[model samples]
Target: RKYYINMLHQYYSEESFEPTNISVKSEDYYGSNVLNFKQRNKAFKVFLLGDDKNKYKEKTHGLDVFAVPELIDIKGGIYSVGGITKKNVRSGFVSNPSLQVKKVDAKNGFSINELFFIQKEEVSLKELDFKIRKLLIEKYRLYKGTSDKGRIVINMKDEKKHEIDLSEKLSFERMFDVMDSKQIKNIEVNLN
Candidate 1:
């Protein structure tokens, strides 16, 4: 939940409607946008193209598509969701998906280096999205140490990119806020 929520906050700024400290009494956390347990275990597709814009690679996801615009920008490529639809294909942007996640990776790319699948069916879309993202990131940096009984750890990058650790409350709150931010318009999900 924190991963999903924080992903949201990382994208959208703070807002009253996107509060992370609300009651989890219902599945959505708040409003009709958050929990939507119906979204769990759903399949999604991601499309990628090299600089040409016409040719590309197609990837699959059982939950959510992990996007990192920073990596895409650095490598030179474009990505989009909504399967093979032309409309959504045209919708991807410089900050495509616009989630502004602190965690993501680009280990390699020939226009779209690595496209991974989540083999674990039980995991949440957002959870595994972050997991795969983190693993890709780990390929570059060294895992440092952990405290808080292994709840938190540190990573040391050889160059500049620093990492920030979000608290449980803040993380969940922000991720939910991100969902409310309307950044997920590209992918089509069945609300039923």
Candidate 2:
């Protein structure tokens, strides 16, 4: 009945591609709020048909929804279920339903100006801190200690810059606080 649809955008770099996860909620398992299709021949109708086929002609559109077992939670345990394909709409109900749907630029895909969600976590904050630290460490060499002490350089896209001396010690929360205090946007970070 209730489901969470995560729209994934495949971002291509100079030579590589990565999927960015944009999570959202839906009341239907088929994700009809974003995807339009008949209940009878859902896959063929949505992915292949003409006129009646689901088309992302506008800037905002939905992608093909797929059921991912890894993203779903049942009762107090996590289980792997089926129904990823076209047929078998009612395989099982998701106690904590979450699906990751990829946005494609190919035929029957979306232009995706903005993704819409009907509605909008804990331990989640720690998980988020972990993810942020991991990304900073992996991508920007955070705390790598190339010099005697490391400094975080936040360069705003609007020709403004902010610096945090890691010599004192900095947490992800503190970094976020600084960014919020300064109303930072579209930033590039460097650690040295």
Candidate 3:
């Protein structure tokens, strides 16, 4: 929540796009706050979708299924026979959530905006569906918390929600699953 505004000045050869060691302040480097989606979709979105997309583009996608790791954790204590804390990813990992501003290239009606994750784990279909819904719901929650300065494309592969505008947080959090594992291959968030 604490942001420091820094000024960036660039000087380049005749071809500005040419190679240059124009170091981007670490903030732009994509650090820990970088969620899986950040590493994938948001990365490309930022590199390609400049300021113009903010004004012209109706929306830009952000959240993406960066990868299906061998594991994913769902932070919950099971009430079954043993009553142990449930853990799963390839089943589903309780994703660490982070958000950033993303604008789309209006020229491209819609960019995949998503980066797919290949799961190394052999998870069941039932658990995979559950995982998908869980993320889709989380996406909605994060969107709700956004400043409302723009919109994000919603690809709720979590439950096949496949709806746009994942910003409204509260309404979606109620949709949680405690049944099985889930592996999401792709997720998309919109930017405006």
Winning model by TM-score: 3
Between the candidate structures 1 and 3, which one is better when assessed by lDDT? 3
TM-score comparison, 1 vs 2, better candidate: 2
- The RMSD of every model to the true structure, in order and in angstroms, is 18.9, 20.2, 19.9
Clashes by residue pair, model 2:
none
| CA deviation > 4 Å runs, candidate 1 | 1-34, 37-90, 94-137, 140-163, 166-170, 177-192
Count clashing residue pairs per candidate: 10, 0, 27
Cα lDDT tens digits for candidate 1, 1-192? 536544533432211111111111112112221111112333112232223222222322223323322112233332222112111122223322212222222343222223333222222233323443354234422121211111112111232221224222223222211121122222211100
Candidate 2 on 35-78: residue-level lDDT in tens?
Answer: 22322222111121223223333432222222112222233222
- lDDT accuracy of residue 163 in candidate 3: 36
Model 3 error, position 99 (Å): 11
Task: Compute the lDDT of residue 76 as modeled in candidate 2.
Answer: 21
Q: Any runs in candidate 3 off by more than 4 Å, and if so which?
A: 1-85, 89-102, 105-159, 162-167, 172-175, 178-182
**Each prediction's TM-score versus the true structure:** 0.21, 0.22, 0.25
What are the lDDT scores of the predictions, listed in order? 0.24, 0.25, 0.25
What digit string (tens of lDDT, one per residue) describes model 3 on residues 1-192? Answer: 212101000000001111111111111224211111122111211111222112212322321121222222253211100011122333344432222234464665434322233232322222233333334334533323323233332223365533333223212122222222133333344544
